[PDB]
Amino acid sequence: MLSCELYRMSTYSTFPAGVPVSERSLARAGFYYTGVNDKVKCFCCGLMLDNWKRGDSPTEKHKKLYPSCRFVQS
Ligand SMILES: [Zn+2]
């Protein structure tokens, strides 16, 4: 249903701290929180991503992994 930068930011309320990637960027790319520790998923393509490194661009990786996503255009 709802898949904006605000609704996707509301799923990052129970997200574990200490993560090396800003929640905004994660939601900006088109991912949200599913509940699993460090577990996001695309809203258009629905790609799951976790265990990120330091300074990793969510958008870049998203297009580098699933470039067929309709929300990966922007
Ligand atoms: Zn996607």
Numbering used by the authors: 25 to 98
The study reports:
IAPs regulate cell death survival pathways, inflammation, and immunity. IAP-mediated regulation of NF-κB signaling depends on different protein–protein (PP) complexes stabilized by type-I BIR domains (i.e. BIR1). The cIAPs protein partners for these functions are TRAF1 (TNF receptor associated factor 1) and TRAF2 for the canonical pathway, and TRAF2 and TRAF3 for the non-canonical pathway. Biochemical and crystallographic studies have shown that the TRAF1/2:cIAP1/2 interaction is based on the formation of the cIAP1:cIAP2 heterodimer, stabilized by the interaction of the RING domains, and the TRAF1:(TRAF2)2 heterotrimer.
FC2 was found as ligand of XIAP-BIR1/TAB1 and of cIAP2-BIR1/TRAF2. FC2 displayed dissociation constants in the micromolar range for both the target domains in vitro (Kd[cIAP2-BIR1] = 0.5 ± 0.2 µM; Kd [XIAP-BIR1] = 5.2 ± 1.0 µM). We tried to obtain a 3D structure of cIAP2-BIR1 bound to FC2, however the diffracting co-crystal did not show any residual electron density attributable to the ligand, even if the crystallographic dimeric assembly of the protein (stabilized by a symmetric Cys28-Cys28 disulfide bridge) did not hinder the predicted binding site.
